[PDB]
């Protein structure tokens, strides 16, 4: 049974994005705490990630974008406003006390784990703080400041010829896509809502460019997708992907805003369905790096990643939530699982099979025997 | 809503290391381990130790409400501290228990919830009801001697409070 | 914005 | 006031055993050891264990007054039980601690003082003030369901009671 | 440093002699408990004594005296009254529930320890329950029912040619004397009040009989004896005794009613003085068997034997009494030691030296070179 | 008596 490494820094739950802001880092602390009380903590190798310095963040980002982040504060907020606009820091990506500390922990977790995978001293490595996939080389976007994912992947390329990147998050993983848009060594597959939704990118025809053409897979979706519909379009596509792209290390971003009843999301997935993807990936027995991502009904974010951690340990846990410091957060029910809503699935079988086929064609264009 | 191409967008792809080349990455600068998963201990023994770690804690706060102190001592901070005490002592139960009672005296771990004074708690419920969830101003004007990040940790712990009923 | 603050 | 001589007064003197003869005395029929004085343990560790044995006890009686429960758990019966738990487990701290928390659940030792009900205690203070220190009649007429020797043990423990003030 | 074995059965404190009766077994439990809290318990080998059966009690006593004791109860108290008078069970030796159990524990402790000494697996052995020295072959006397001392000594004779018996108790040790009155193998030395006092025996001229003549030493005394006077007459006499009687096992009865402020006693000794005797004996490095005996101001009985146990371990203890279940018993002071009273010492130097000399003559009559 | 009950 696969060996799992879990990365966590106690401080991460305590950093705060701002009044009225949906991204709430505290959800990782909630997970952490459930893991301890579900007895899972016990069963995996627990690491505190040292802070990632500007040194390794600039391995992808601008020497003067990170410089800006290292420097900016809420003190000198009116002094910098020039650079604030050039870098996207505001309306939905606030400045906030500790921001750079927050980035260092998220990035440290992902990088340390990548190394751990390259050093071949784990099979799976988990960092729920990480997964922040909207970030760009020279600007912040969609609550993401540093793209820990890219940096993580860049380290893996040192030992792995082909790195597969899978993205479940309801929002299209455009940061990780754009960063690797012109390379054939990394294939970016993404399943997301599309049409009057952020980030506006990742439609059927977004295939890549140059050497990276036919290496950026996307599955655009409308509202209300079931576990059943999602499963029936994830497994086929990913089996082909493995078949064709034949990777040697997987990085699964396990965005939890694709769950039902999310604050920002509008999909109808249950923890069970959501996790079935993690389990399917894990089954392909490749060095795997689970990251988190979005999720804005934190009670369920907690539930999800707690469950999905169990999946990486292939151990069973009861629906009965164990007592914990935040036990009272979990409704009148205090259960682990969520059920789907009456919400209407506007992804007709006809619409999913059209897209599926188009992708199967795209994937066939890769070399094989 | 557009994806861009160019030196200022894509990442420089890191070349695969030669069979002779080495990545040169110091692992101690990157991580520090907090729990080994393959221990000479069994679930029962760890479980047992956790009970003991809890008992000490209750007896600690008895030396300067019974159920209250026990619950206080049963909170996660105490448990986490119990799992580190094990790992720091190389999973030696007998050695780890000394750690918990260093010189015949027990150890107290109190989270921000339990640690704050009655009057600090009071201040917080005035600052919230007055500034909502604006935690930098809540400190500046109401709890300026506390560090922002302790006020955050407190907030979330306080949201589960019993006497706290914002719902109906 | 970016998403929905 | 007289010392007597004769077969019906003096003892028959037991003859010294031959260098080949053996006394023939089964030592297990005569004694059973309760504490070895040469232990692999140090004073500190025993002391520490005693603190732990006390903490469990307090946490035990928290699971069905803080200072009261701690004092209750600090009484001698609990300590004596702690010194036996050590010896029974061959002075293995790690093994002995399991004994104290058998299956994740702590153990309670209560002397007759603590163990009696409020109403039994009450009965006793009526029986004493009425029959003085006549403990067979105190049982017969007031606490007939208790064994005489438990009433004795209780008596002496009760004589140190705080609310007890026969002196001025 | 000498090895010590301590014998105790938890039940012994709980047996009760009767309303208004001075002998209170609870004083042993008080000692036991101090020993634990003074940290001394820790330092010696602790044994629970199994019950001594009629088998070994009849090794000295009547087959029908023990039979009587095994049988008698407070139930059949009016049925037996015939035998009650023949055996002395009444006015100051009551019948009481558990009586025979009590005897078995007191005797078991002494016998087990004797064996332990013969088996050469201890240097000192301590049984505070024991020491009950007024008992006779066919009758109870002075609160004593079974003479554990004799039985103990009888076992020691199996390995020891000469057994010395020393008796500090304020009352003359006539049970142990009478039992060995005609033998030269056991020498019984006793220091006690005399003249209108119990048991009426043990004056200067009580020397023994037959083979046992010049082997029963006695020191008669009046009221108010100091530590200073006592020390100055104990050491000289005992050094001669060792010199002459040359024993190979000592049995010291450490009666605590010779202390100051006893309920029944009228001597003016402090724990310190009293113990100086135990220390002096111990110094002669012989297999030693410490027993208790009388003592009727139990707070001090507790103090004494606790202290004297330390002496056998030659460890220091503070005057500060440690907390314990019966801590509140010990006055406003909560100290270990007692000081002597203004009470007048009617043992003039002239009177002590007259007696001393007479005894030195008696002891010279023994064989030597 | 024997001693002093
Ligand atoms: O404390 P915050 O991080 O600001 O989040 C709270 C919190 O949501 P979470 O419990 O999911 O963190 C409230 O939930 P309760 O405290 O009531 O359980 C929620 O209230 P509702 O769940 O009733 O919406 C409230 O939302 P609102 O401010 O709209 O009342 C929302 O604050 P934010 O909306 O600022 O995140
Ligand atoms: O409980 P018991 O075994 O019968 O002994 C008690 C007890 O004496 P101890 O404390 O030494 O056992 C009393 O002492 P306190 O309870 O007052 O501390 C004492 O009272 P005094 O010390 O004030 O004399 C009293 O004696 P009395 O009955 O004369 O009041 C005496 O009972 P006995 O005399 O029956 O032994
Ligand atoms: K996605
Ligand atoms: K690509
Ligand atoms: K004497
Ligand atoms: K003799
Ligand atoms: Zn998202
Ligand atoms: Zn006496």
Author numbering:
A (entry chain B), E (entry chain B): 8 to 376
B (entry chain A), D (entry chain A): 165 to 228, 237 to 340
C (entry chain C), F (entry chain C): 14 to 18
What do the authors say?
Class I histone deacetylases (HDACs) are enzymes involved in ‘epigenetic' gene regulation through controlling the acetylation state of lysine sidechains in histone tails. They act as the catalytic subunit of several large protein complexes that repress gene expression when targeted to the genome. HDACs 1–3 are assembled into at least five large multi-protein co-repressor complexes that are recruited to chromatin through interaction with repressive transcription factors or other silencing co-factors. Recent structural and functional studies of class I HDACs in complex with their cognate co-repressors have suggested that the activity of these complexes is regulated in the cell by inositol phosphates that are likely derived from membrane phospholipids.
To understand how a substrate, such as the histone H4 tail, interacts with HDAC1, we synthesized a novel inhibitor based on this peptide. This inhibitor (termed H4K16Hx) comprises residues 12–18 of histone H4 with K16 being replaced by a hydroxamic acid functionality. To investigate this, we soaked crystals of the HDAC1:MTA1 complex (which had been co-crystallized with a peptide-based inhibitor) with 225 mM InsP6 before freezing for data collection. The structure shows that the InsP6 is bound as predicted in the pocket formed at the interface of HDAC1 and MTA1, adjacent to the active site of HDAC1. In particular the inositol ring is tipped away from the HDAC (towards MTA1), which seems to correlate with the sidechain of R270 (HDAC1) adopting a different position from that of the corresponding R265 in HDAC3. The molecule is supported in this new position through a hydrogen bond between the hydroxyl of Y336 and the C3 phosphate group of the InsP6. Careful analysis of the orientation of the InsP6 molecule at the inter-molecular interface showed that the electron density clearly fits best when the inositol phosphate orientation is rotated by 120° relative to that seen in the HDAC3:SMRT:Ins(1,4,5,6)P4 complex. The peptide was observed to be bound at the active site of the enzyme with nearly 100% occupancy, although residues Lys12 and Gly13 were not observed in the electron-density map suggesting that these are not constrained on substrate binding. Several backbone amides in the H4K16 peptide make complementary polar contacts with the sidechain of D99 at the rim of the HDAC active site. Comparison with the structure in the absence of the histone peptide suggests that this residue, and its immediate neighbours, undergo a conformation change on peptide binding.
